[PDB]
Amino acid sequence: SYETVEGEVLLTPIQQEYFSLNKTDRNHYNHAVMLYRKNGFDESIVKRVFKEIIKHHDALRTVFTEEDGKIIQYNRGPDKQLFDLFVYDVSSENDQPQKVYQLATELQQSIDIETGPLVKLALFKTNNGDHLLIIIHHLVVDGISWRILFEDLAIGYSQLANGEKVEFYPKTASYQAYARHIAEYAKSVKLLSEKQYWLKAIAEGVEFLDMNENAGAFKVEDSRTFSTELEKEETKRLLRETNRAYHTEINDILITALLVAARDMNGQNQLRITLEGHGREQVADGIDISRTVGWFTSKYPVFIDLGQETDMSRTIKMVKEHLRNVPNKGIGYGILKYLTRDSEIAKGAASPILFNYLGQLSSSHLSPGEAAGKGITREHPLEINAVVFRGKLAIQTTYNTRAYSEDVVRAFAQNYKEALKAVIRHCAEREETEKTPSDYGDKGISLDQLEEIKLKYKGMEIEKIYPLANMQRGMLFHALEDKESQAYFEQMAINMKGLIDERLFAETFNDIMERHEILRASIEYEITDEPRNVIIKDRKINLDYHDLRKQSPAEREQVIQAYRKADREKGFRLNSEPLIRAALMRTEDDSYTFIWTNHHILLDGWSRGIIMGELFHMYHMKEARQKHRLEEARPYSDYIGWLQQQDKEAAKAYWRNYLSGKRKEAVIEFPEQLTGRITELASRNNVTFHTVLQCIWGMLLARYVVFGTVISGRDAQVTGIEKMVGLFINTVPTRIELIKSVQEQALEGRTYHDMNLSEVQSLSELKRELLDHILIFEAGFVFEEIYGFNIVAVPGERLVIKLTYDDHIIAGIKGHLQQVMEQVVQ
């Protein structure tokens, strides 16, 4: 999909930063590489490869022109001057390194942004090989872009030398499209939600080293660079046996050493630095730039304040956590500063130091010259670059002479090396690996809060921690609001007939626990700010097995009913105790009684049936010595993560406008023809059977309006929802060709069927008086099964409606039901 772009392109924030800092001597600031080929460079081939390279990476042709102080960036067409190629013969000089350097430096300052092409070349010829110089202005290339250029040139040169036409890989999204993409993202509400974060990162300035106030503008001519290194032994410890202490990365240790060094000399536990990101991860789902050539570097500040904490074991954790809390990898700050132009953002203090860790690591031996001008202004007095060349960490320290003296910077570099060694030895000698809140998936937990959760659940390994779903949160809030501690219990008794191996049933039961993590979850609401699901790794639940075969069935039933009464009396204390309890008692040889109790938070009735079915399937596979066949279970955390993904402020808007205004049972069976007739009416109107029956109930309510309907809550766009275990059941209110009109009412709420009823009625005038009732629509061993106003309807050949009320009025309810479901059909 090769294309070509031409015309105005918006300035990316990195480009806008370049023009703001550099107002004079902006002509030459380049990215230069020297290459050596033993057999020599064919002048015909190199000028043809670069001709195709430039028109394939359209950023290289762009031009920056000025109009009364404003900068307009234009992308030139392929027909204009693409590059300048110069060829030199330094074979006979006998002082080639001197001659090539002076030639390369002169050509490196010849770039005119307004007129000249931004790519210029210099081929040097020697009797012992040829050298090619590639100079590209930094406004159209970065570190990753040159890696792309090298691959295309290597493929292009090899294939062109073999006679074939040059054809590169298909072009990705243009830099012009990328610039317009981030500019559109500049006014998105998602980015503007990060203003308070970046305000904190720039609110205060760090004194750091003693700086000369009269340094003026920091420049390249006033900047010196020296490097310090760690020996191989200590560098080996950092790479291998350091990250294991707290599950950190190499960048965490180096940044921590920066704070430790500043802590020892400045006395403050606060440090502000600027970090460089490659800026190639898409901010919003859309344009990708995997192969696009351009300047995608994104700079953002990070301000770390540890208060009074000096225990460096704690320091490493909270420094790692602070780096884990940067939103969108820091791309937001650059967009917010230059594309949104927030005045508060533009007034932040300058970061005293710029830090960047490149990572781990034919080429020519001749220098390419100075790639930057002496008049180029640099916004950071200090720059630190850390690289491991062979096996040793080389710390390249760049400082401005006018800002800091040489001895001061070398002193800072030396004790930063000492501070780094202090951090390395602390992690190397660490015995046990300490997990961090970001490692558990929830970075909203403080270090102390995690320790209390660990302390509360001591003796148990925590697997994952994530917040409760809004369905679970509503359940817990009225669970603490004691409703006699009876509405939160789901207790059933299921007897089964057959010969059961006790260990296999327990093992099959435990395999269910591992399969569904929510059953192993314990609710935490006191330690954390919000209720949070704490999942224990090896949390088992004991299936207490008592035989009691040798007694009368009436005597057995007395013990069975006593246990059902006794365990219901116990309740759920939520004191770090499992919320699932099951008992297996053996009435006789092939007749058991299995009772199951659970808290409403963990699962619903739909999930309850799934567990029983999976338990039935897996156990029989155990008997046959054949592995079970079953779909992979999707974690309940994925649904919660999706739930937190989409915003529900519009969901609140949806419901607020919608709302503007002794146990007895009875069974009603209708003729099969009557049930069949209304089903035909639903099909002809393209209206669901749920919708048509809602209208028939709604019209009656007008004579006595909005009523409550129970929904599975399993329509979310998460894979495997229908077969995953969790709390998805919900009751939602519905307000009432009429069947067609409310048919689209159901689909409008389909997107917003995820919030609890208690918060929906808060948007209503009647509040708790909104709903008076609910409407419900429905060799081994074998199974067998044994509000105060709810209505249940069961479809089938004959319509059956079961109504429970906690007397002749009931007859009147039935009589009017059948009389009104007759006139409309005819």
mmCIF file with all atom_site columns, C-alpha atoms in Angstrom, residues 667-755:
data_model
loop_
_atom_site.group_PDB
_atom_site.id
_atom_site.type_symbol
_atom_site.label_atom_id
_atom_site.label_alt_id
_atom_site.label_comp_id
_atom_site.label_asym_id
_atom_site.label_entity_id
_atom_site.label_seq_id
_atom_site.pdbx_PDB_ins_code
_atom_site.Cartn_x
_atom_site.Cartn_y
_atom_site.Cartn_z
_atom_site.occupancy
_atom_site.B_iso_or_equiv
_atom_site.pdbx_formal_charge
_atom_site.auth_seq_id
_atom_site.auth_comp_id
_atom_site.auth_asym_id
_atom_site.auth_atom_id
_atom_site.pdbx_PDB_model_num
ATOM 1  C CA . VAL A 1 667 ? -50.065 -21.057 39.468 1.00 0.00 ? 667 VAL A CA 1
ATOM 2  C CA . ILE A 1 668 ? -51.905 -20.080 36.276 1.00 0.00 ? 668 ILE A CA 1
ATOM 3  C CA . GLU A 1 669 ? -51.783 -22.449 33.296 1.00 0.00 ? 669 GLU A CA 1
ATOM 4  C CA . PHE A 1 670 ? -53.074 -21.226 29.939 1.00 0.00 ? 670 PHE A CA 1
ATOM 5  C CA . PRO A 1 671 ? -54.230 -23.306 26.955 1.00 0.00 ? 671 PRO A CA 1
ATOM 6  C CA . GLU A 1 672 ? -51.519 -24.385 24.534 1.00 0.00 ? 672 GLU A CA 1
ATOM 7  C CA . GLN A 1 673 ? -53.299 -22.596 21.679 1.00 0.00 ? 673 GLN A CA 1
ATOM 8  C CA . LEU A 1 674 ? -53.401 -19.354 23.686 1.00 0.00 ? 674 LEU A CA 1
ATOM 9  C CA . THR A 1 675 ? -49.679 -19.587 24.456 1.00 0.00 ? 675 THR A CA 1
ATOM 10 C CA . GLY A 1 676 ? -48.951 -20.441 20.826 1.00 0.00 ? 676 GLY A CA 1
ATOM 11 C CA . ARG A 1 677 ? -51.053 -17.581 19.453 1.00 0.00 ? 677 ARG A CA 1
ATOM 12 C CA . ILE A 1 678 ? -49.198 -14.818 21.304 1.00 0.00 ? 678 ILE A CA 1
ATOM 13 C CA . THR A 1 679 ? -45.858 -16.361 20.299 1.00 0.00 ? 679 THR A CA 1
ATOM 14 C CA . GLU A 1 680 ? -46.925 -16.028 16.657 1.00 0.00 ? 680 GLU A CA 1
ATOM 15 C CA . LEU A 1 681 ? -47.758 -12.360 17.265 1.00 0.00 ? 681 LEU A CA 1
ATOM 16 C CA . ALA A 1 682 ? -44.288 -11.770 18.714 1.00 0.00 ? 682 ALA A CA 1
ATOM 17 C CA . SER A 1 683 ? -42.629 -13.354 15.670 1.00 0.00 ? 683 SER A CA 1
ATOM 18 C CA . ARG A 1 684 ? -44.649 -11.383 13.107 1.00 0.00 ? 684 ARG A CA 1
ATOM 19 C CA . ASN A 1 685 ? -43.823 -8.072  14.827 1.00 0.00 ? 685 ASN A CA 1
ATOM 20 C CA . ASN A 1 686 ? -40.098 -8.941  15.115 1.00 0.00 ? 686 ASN A CA 1
ATOM 21 C CA . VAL A 1 687 ? -40.535 -8.411  18.868 1.00 0.00 ? 687 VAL A CA 1
ATOM 22 C CA . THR A 1 688 ? -39.109 -10.673 21.563 1.00 0.00 ? 688 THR A CA 1
ATOM 23 C CA . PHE A 1 689 ? -41.312 -12.719 23.883 1.00 0.00 ? 689 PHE A CA 1
ATOM 24 C CA . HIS A 1 690 ? -39.920 -10.831 26.886 1.00 0.00 ? 690 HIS A CA 1
ATOM 25 C CA . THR A 1 691 ? -41.031 -7.511  25.399 1.00 0.00 ? 691 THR A CA 1
ATOM 26 C CA . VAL A 1 692 ? -44.629 -8.476  24.586 1.00 0.00 ? 692 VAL A CA 1
ATOM 27 C CA . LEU A 1 693 ? -45.265 -9.918  28.054 1.00 0.00 ? 693 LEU A CA 1
ATOM 28 C CA . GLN A 1 694 ? -43.818 -6.799  29.697 1.00 0.00 ? 694 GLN A CA 1
ATOM 29 C CA . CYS A 1 695 ? -46.443 -4.647  27.957 1.00 0.00 ? 695 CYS A CA 1
ATOM 30 C CA . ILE A 1 696 ? -49.293 -6.878  29.153 1.00 0.00 ? 696 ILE A CA 1
ATOM 31 C CA . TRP A 1 697 ? -48.093 -6.449  32.736 1.00 0.00 ? 697 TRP A CA 1
ATOM 32 C CA . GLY A 1 698 ? -47.350 -2.747  32.254 1.00 0.00 ? 698 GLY A CA 1
ATOM 33 C CA . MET A 1 699 ? -50.875 -1.803  31.169 1.00 0.00 ? 699 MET A CA 1
ATOM 34 C CA . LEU A 1 700 ? -52.347 -3.348  34.320 1.00 0.00 ? 700 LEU A CA 1
ATOM 35 C CA . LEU A 1 701 ? -49.962 -1.291  36.469 1.00 0.00 ? 701 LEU A CA 1
ATOM 36 C CA . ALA A 1 702 ? -51.436 1.872   34.940 1.00 0.00 ? 702 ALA A CA 1
ATOM 37 C CA . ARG A 1 703 ? -54.850 0.931   36.346 1.00 0.00 ? 703 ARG A CA 1
ATOM 38 C CA . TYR A 1 704 ? -53.515 0.243   39.858 1.00 0.00 ? 704 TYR A CA 1
ATOM 39 C CA . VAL A 1 705 ? -45.739 3.036   35.486 1.00 0.00 ? 705 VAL A CA 1
ATOM 40 C CA . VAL A 1 706 ? -42.337 1.364   35.915 1.00 0.00 ? 706 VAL A CA 1
ATOM 41 C CA . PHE A 1 707 ? -41.633 -2.120  37.289 1.00 0.00 ? 707 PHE A CA 1
ATOM 42 C CA . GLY A 1 708 ? -38.500 -4.179  37.881 1.00 0.00 ? 708 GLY A CA 1
ATOM 43 C CA . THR A 1 709 ? -37.158 -6.925  35.623 1.00 0.00 ? 709 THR A CA 1
ATOM 44 C CA . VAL A 1 710 ? -34.398 -9.406  36.443 1.00 0.00 ? 710 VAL A CA 1
ATOM 45 C CA . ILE A 1 711 ? -31.651 -9.669  33.818 1.00 0.00 ? 711 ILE A CA 1
ATOM 46 C CA . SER A 1 712 ? -28.730 -12.072 33.558 1.00 0.00 ? 712 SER A CA 1
ATOM 47 C CA . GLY A 1 713 ? -26.325 -9.171  33.013 1.00 0.00 ? 713 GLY A CA 1
ATOM 48 C CA . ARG A 1 714 ? -24.335 -11.365 30.621 1.00 0.00 ? 714 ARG A CA 1
ATOM 49 C CA . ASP A 1 715 ? -24.601 -9.385  27.366 1.00 0.00 ? 715 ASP A CA 1
ATOM 50 C CA . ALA A 1 716 ? -21.314 -7.498  27.815 1.00 0.00 ? 716 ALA A CA 1
ATOM 51 C CA . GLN A 1 717 ? -18.751 -7.547  24.994 1.00 0.00 ? 717 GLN A CA 1
ATOM 52 C CA . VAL A 1 718 ? -16.374 -9.796  26.936 1.00 0.00 ? 718 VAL A CA 1
ATOM 53 C CA . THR A 1 719 ? -15.419 -13.179 25.508 1.00 0.00 ? 719 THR A CA 1
ATOM 54 C CA . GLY A 1 720 ? -16.760 -16.172 27.409 1.00 0.00 ? 720 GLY A CA 1
ATOM 55 C CA . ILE A 1 721 ? -19.190 -14.231 29.609 1.00 0.00 ? 721 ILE A CA 1
ATOM 56 C CA . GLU A 1 722 ? -21.972 -16.814 29.291 1.00 0.00 ? 722 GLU A CA 1
ATOM 57 C CA . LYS A 1 723 ? -19.811 -19.545 30.865 1.00 0.00 ? 723 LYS A CA 1
ATOM 58 C CA . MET A 1 724 ? -17.786 -17.538 33.405 1.00 0.00 ? 724 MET A CA 1
ATOM 59 C CA . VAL A 1 725 ? -18.478 -17.516 37.152 1.00 0.00 ? 725 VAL A CA 1
ATOM 60 C CA . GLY A 1 726 ? -19.289 -14.242 38.879 1.00 0.00 ? 726 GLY A CA 1
ATOM 61 C CA . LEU A 1 727 ? -21.987 -11.874 40.086 1.00 0.00 ? 727 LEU A CA 1
ATOM 62 C CA . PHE A 1 728 ? -23.774 -10.785 36.906 1.00 0.00 ? 728 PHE A CA 1
ATOM 63 C CA . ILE A 1 729 ? -27.447 -10.939 37.946 1.00 0.00 ? 729 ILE A CA 1
ATOM 64 C CA . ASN A 1 730 ? -29.193 -7.578  38.181 1.00 0.00 ? 730 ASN A CA 1
ATOM 65 C CA . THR A 1 731 ? -32.666 -6.068  38.470 1.00 0.00 ? 731 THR A CA 1
ATOM 66 C CA . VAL A 1 732 ? -33.383 -3.076  36.231 1.00 0.00 ? 732 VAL A CA 1
ATOM 67 C CA . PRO A 1 733 ? -36.550 -0.940  36.013 1.00 0.00 ? 733 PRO A CA 1
ATOM 68 C CA . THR A 1 734 ? -38.481 -0.646  32.758 1.00 0.00 ? 734 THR A CA 1
ATOM 69 C CA . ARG A 1 735 ? -41.004 2.144   32.173 1.00 0.00 ? 735 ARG A CA 1
ATOM 70 C CA . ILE A 1 736 ? -44.134 1.685   30.068 1.00 0.00 ? 736 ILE A CA 1
ATOM 71 C CA . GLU A 1 737 ? -47.211 -1.214  18.107 1.00 0.00 ? 737 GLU A CA 1
ATOM 72 C CA . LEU A 1 738 ? -46.747 -0.463  21.803 1.00 0.00 ? 738 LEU A CA 1
ATOM 73 C CA . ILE A 1 739 ? -44.692 -3.655  22.137 1.00 0.00 ? 739 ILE A CA 1
ATOM 74 C CA . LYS A 1 740 ? -42.420 -2.338  19.380 1.00 0.00 ? 740 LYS A CA 1
ATOM 75 C CA . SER A 1 741 ? -41.963 0.986   21.192 1.00 0.00 ? 741 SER A CA 1
ATOM 76 C CA . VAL A 1 742 ? -40.640 -0.676  24.362 1.00 0.00 ? 742 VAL A CA 1
ATOM 77 C CA . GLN A 1 743 ? -38.665 -3.193  22.286 1.00 0.00 ? 743 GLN A CA 1
ATOM 78 C CA . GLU A 1 744 ? -36.112 -0.494  21.457 1.00 0.00 ? 744 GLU A CA 1
ATOM 79 C CA . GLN A 1 745 ? -36.265 0.590   25.103 1.00 0.00 ? 745 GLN A CA 1
ATOM 80 C CA . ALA A 1 746 ? -34.640 -2.730  26.028 1.00 0.00 ? 746 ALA A CA 1
ATOM 81 C CA . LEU A 1 747 ? -31.788 -2.338  23.530 1.00 0.00 ? 747 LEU A CA 1
ATOM 82 C CA . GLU A 1 748 ? -31.045 1.226   24.655 1.00 0.00 ? 748 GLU A CA 1
ATOM 83 C CA . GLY A 1 749 ? -30.501 -0.043  28.195 1.00 0.00 ? 749 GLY A CA 1
ATOM 84 C CA . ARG A 1 750 ? -28.568 -3.029  26.842 1.00 0.00 ? 750 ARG A CA 1
ATOM 85 C CA . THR A 1 751 ? -25.442 -0.855  26.865 1.00 0.00 ? 751 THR A CA 1
ATOM 86 C CA . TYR A 1 752 ? -26.217 0.435   30.383 1.00 0.00 ? 752 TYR A CA 1
ATOM 87 C CA . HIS A 1 753 ? -27.443 -2.742  32.114 1.00 0.00 ? 753 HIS A CA 1
ATOM 88 C CA . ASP A 1 754 ? -24.287 -2.926  34.253 1.00 0.00 ? 754 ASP A CA 1
ATOM 89 C CA . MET A 1 755 ? -25.068 -0.686  37.248 1.00 0.00 ? 755 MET A CA 1
#
